[PDB]
Each structure stands twice: as structure tokens, then as C-alpha cells.
Amino acid sequence: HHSGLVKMSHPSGDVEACMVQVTCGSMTLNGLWLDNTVWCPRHVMCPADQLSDPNYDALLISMTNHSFSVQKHILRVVGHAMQGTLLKLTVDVANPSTPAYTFTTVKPGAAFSVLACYNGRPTGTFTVVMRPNYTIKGSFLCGSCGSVGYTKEGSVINFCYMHQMELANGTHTGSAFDGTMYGAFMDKQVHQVQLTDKYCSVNVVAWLYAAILNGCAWFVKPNRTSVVSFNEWALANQFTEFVGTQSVDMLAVKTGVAIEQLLYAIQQLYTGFQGKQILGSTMLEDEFTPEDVNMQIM
Amino acid sequence: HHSGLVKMSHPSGDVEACMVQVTCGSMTLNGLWLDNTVWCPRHVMCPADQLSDPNYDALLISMTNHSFSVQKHILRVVGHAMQGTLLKLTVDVANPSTPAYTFTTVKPGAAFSVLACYNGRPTGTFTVVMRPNYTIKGSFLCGSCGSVGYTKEGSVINFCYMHQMELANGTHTGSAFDGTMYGAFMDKQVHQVQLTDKYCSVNVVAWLYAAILNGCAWFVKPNRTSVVSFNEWALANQFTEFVGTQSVDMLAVKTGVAIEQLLYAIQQLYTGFQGKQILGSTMLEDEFTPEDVNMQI
Ligand SMILES: *[C@H](O)[C@H](C[C@@H]1CCNC1=O)NC(=O)[C@H](CC(C)C)NC(=O)OC1(CC)COCOC1
Ligand SMILES: *[C@H](O)[C@H](C[C@@H]1CCNC1=O)NC(=O)[C@H](CC(C)C)NC(=O)OC1(CC)COCOC1
């Protein structure tokens, strides 16, 4: 039986209307236009020559307002400032289609939608999970910097990601809109090695609950492992700490299966399913959130 | 090395601007507002009483323009007609934000984006492949009917799907905008026979080309299988006919690996990967198209 559990993104129309192109010298990339502000990665300031150790503080000082061209395809710069790894440009027109929005940094295990853009033009959207080593997968090519990641709750878009770089293992990372880089990677063209990744324990729990809701519960036993005990074990076996949420609790109430029975199951299943499948899979899946499962299976 | 091959959907803003809610008596679902026309599934006319064997001809005749209610959230009806499994409702206002569009019927193995909506409100977007048995997977709950699927060529939107139903096995189907149901399923709540699914051969090829581009070419051999022999083999082993395309050919040039080497490879991998993985998988993957791979790698 097909569960209906799929990778689902937020509808992108609200964010499409905020995308612009930003150009500084030879470098061109994407920006986010909210009210009188345009956000973009500060390495737009850097010519290809100096990208391997840029001096951003000096590059900023060398700019004037005319050093930045902002074009909408889908504007006069009247101020420029740097905030961590982002530029905050002030323009003289308020974006007439600005959504209600917040700037909240996301934590590992949380999912968000990405609007991939090139030269200020949206081309595709996908959902990613912020990994425990502060990278994301997804699909990003040359020109994609400034593409944004977001969630939506009610009318309020939460902007959580602005794309900056690809790592040698092909994963990606970027900034929060407070200017910090996820994982503290440097916006320098240099080899940087991401830390070891981990299974997102709370999302594995959610997926097992999706399995139960879908009629697949051969892995459920009476046996349990406490949260506190599971977390001691998680540290030493490449799992995140489990932190419960009202979203997980809803799934436990619906199924009648306790969180702690699934923490025991995870300790038995992460080595393999001994020939069985769970939701068409032979390994544990950690990129569906408790919210995904509540939204899509209930 | 993560390939960067992911399930990607089209930006949905153009289509979001066309979604409305359609209400008829006590039933409510989504509709697509293009110019002066609102498209929605005809079963909005059916009371819960009679979902098993609705008489859509008599239901239509019993309706008047005032039977229908159309609200834009993200309108007065002055005309109603039935086209196959869809209603075509004429409203007095023409949608100002109507994109350039066409209507197409997608074929098995082709990918399209779906804007899932509830009560006229877009809530999510995902990409599906029309399966060889004319069903799709995806995620659709109660209230999702009238959600639409589409591709793009340029800024042109090609509307190809309007969601209608879920089958006993959890898969889904819908209408093309000429009113025909994909796979000729009936818009009634009765058990109906679904053909067995098959691997979409051309997409498996594209997936192996993506593996090669990503530096995973252990399955590659100079052993070849002609398209014709492959096609013969595919009938007895639950695979679709391979049909080359310009898009596949590009991939054979980028990698310098011939189609027939991968056809040969498919025959062997179907019997097993023999301890090895391909792009993190131990089974063949057939929901990534040649166009996906060309665009994403
Ligand atoms: C901005 O559009 C760039 C996006 C990456 C290009 C390929 N895929 C991407 O996601 N970002 C960069 O090019 C970035 C600039 C520095 C932070 C100053 N460098 C980068 O992503 O690094 C490499 C590998 C070390 C990525 O792969 C291509 O070579 C550069
Ligand atoms: C319209 O929004 C409905 C969408 C489905 C409901 C649950 N998931 C869906 O995709 N469509 C229907 O309710 C449909 C109406 C008939 C075509 C007249 N019924 C339906 O999808 O079939 C059932 C039973 C075969 C699927 O299983 C649950 O009950 C409905």
C-alpha cells in the first residue's frame, strides 16, 4: 500500500516575487528583495581572482552605492551594509509583493523548501533537511548563490537559508539571515571538510510512525528504551539526541505506540531489516519530519 | 559524492494564481480559473449519498448556474457544461493573471509538477511520474480533488492533470483537461483493476548516466544489448519499451558511454547489484528523466 509520504515543498509564489539579480563588477548572483532591503551573499563583491582569501572588510569599504546593480526579471541602491556573510542593500522602492516574514535559523533535522534561482529567475523548488553536520543535499549549480530556503506557518514565511557554497562531497551550505554561515564554514574558495553526519533520531521515529499508520508494524515490540537511555546510546552510535515535540506526541496518541518502543526498535533496526522492508525501504529514513507525517498521513 | 540529483518541481506561483474553491451544495473542492473558465471535477455535483454509481448526466441537468459557488482565496457562475470527467464553469470575471498555457496529455515515464490544494488554498508542491499503469503516487487527502498537474516549456504552462481519486492501493489518478481520465478509470467509488507497474526503461538509463557522470561506473562494460533485443527482453520482465531521444543522446556524449552498454547493464542489475550500490541505492530507479539529469548535472 502506497503511504503517500513524499518530498513536498511549500508553494513558491510568495518567494518568487522577491527574487532579484544582483551584480557587482563581474560577479552576478541572486538576491532577496524584502520591503526596501535586498539580501545577497557578500562574495558577490569578490572578483574570481581573489576568491580564495577575500578581504571582505576592505572590499565593502571600496564600494559605493553604484557598485551594486539590482535587476528584477520575474532598482536603485541607496545604502549598503555587511552583516556576517551577507550584504544588506537598501533600495529606493519597497517590494510591493513582500510576504509577512521572519528570520529564524533552523536546527538540524528540520526541513525547508528551497527556490533554486539563476540570474534572478526561479527555475525549480525542492525540500531539504538541515543535516547534523550543517549541510544540505539538493541541487545547486553555478549561478545559484543567493537562492533562498524557507518554511511557511500561517501567512508567515520564515526565511532560513541563503545559498553560498558546495563542498567537496557535493553537499551544500549557506547563511541564515542573521548572517551566520550554517556550520561556520567560511565563504572562501578553499577546501573545507564537513564534520561526520548523523541519523536524525526524531525523524526516524516519525517515519516509523508513518509506517505503523500505513499498516506496517512488524517491527513493533513491547520492549522499550527510555529517552534518556537512548540519548546516551545515540552519542556513541551516530544518532542525534531525541527531543520530543507535540508533533511526535500526536503520532504516539494516534497509533497507540509509545516513543520508547520505537527508540528500542531503532536500536535493533539500524543494522538492517533482516530481509524485511519498511515503507519500501531496507534502511532507516530520516528526512521526513514529525510534521511531514502528521500533515501527509493524517 | 552526493550527485545533486533530486526530486525537483517547477516554481508554482503562476499556477497558484489560478486556484479557486468550487462548491456545489454540500461538496467542496478545487478548481482552475483560466480566462472566463473554471475547471473542476464533475463529482463536485455528487452528494455523499450516491458516490458509488452517480448519474452525472442527470446531476448536470438538475443543476443551474446558481447551484455552483466559486471563491478565490489565494465569482459568479453564468454557464455550466460537462466535458468528460470535468465541469467547465463560465464565470463573469476573466482571470487577469492567466499565464500562457496549453493543455497536454502526459505519457508514462514523463514527470510533472503537482500543486496540491485544499479549499482553494495551495498547500504543497511535489513532482510525480505518470506510471506505465496510468497512475501516480504523490500525496492527496480528502479535499485535494481539483489539484492540478503541469509541465513547462519556457514560460508556457502545460496543464496535464486534474486530481480525481485515490485507488484501493493508495495510488492516485486524475483527468487530462480534455476530460479523459488517465488509464480510463471511472470517477466512481468502485473497485477497479489496475495494471501492474513497470520500470520506465528510458528513465533507468538516464539514472545510470547520472551515476556515470557522478563517477559511479562499475556496472559499465563494453558488452552491449541492442534496443530491439532489449525491448523483446523487457516484455517478459516488467520493463517499458526503450525509445531513444535527443535528451538521452546528449548524456551518451557527455559520458561517452553508449546506450546499448546501459541496456546490457540493466538486464544484469535487474538480477541484482551483487553487493554494490548505485547512487546510494540497491534497486533500479526509474523516476528521474533524461531531462532531469541533463538539467541537474
Ligand atoms: C555561488 O553560485 C556558488 C554555488 C556553487 C557552485 C557550484 N555549486 C554550488 O553550489 N558558490 C561558490 O562557487 C563558492 C564561492 C566561495 C564561497 C567564495 N565556492 C564553491 O562552492 O566551492 C567549490 C568547491 C570547493 C564548489 O564546486 C565548484 O568548485 C568550487
Ligand atoms: C477528492 O478530493 C477526493 C480525493 C481522494 C480522497 C482521499 N485521497 C484522494 O486522493 N476523491 C474522492 O473522494 C473519490 C470520489 C469518486 C471518484 C466519486 N473517491 C476516492 O478517491 O476513492 C476512495 C475509495 C475507492 C479511495 O479510498 C478512500 O475512499 C475513497
Numbering used by the authors:
A (entry chain B): -1 to 72, 78 to 301
B (entry chain A): -1 to 72, 78 to 300
Question: What does the primary publication say about this deposited structure?
Answer:
Coronavirus 3CLpro is a cysteine protease that has two N-terminal domains containing two β-barrel chymotrypsin-like folds. The active site of 3CLpro is located in the cleft between the two domains and is characterized by a catalytic Cys-His dyad. The polyproteins are processed by a 3C-like protease [3CLpro or main protease (MPro)] (11 cleavage sites) and a papain-like protease (PLpro) (3 cleavage sites), resulting in 16 mature nonstructural proteins, including an RNA-dependent RNA polymerase (RdRp). X-ray crystallography confirmed the mechanism of action of the inhibitors, which involves formation of a covalent bond between the active site cysteine and the carbonyl carbon of the aldehyde.
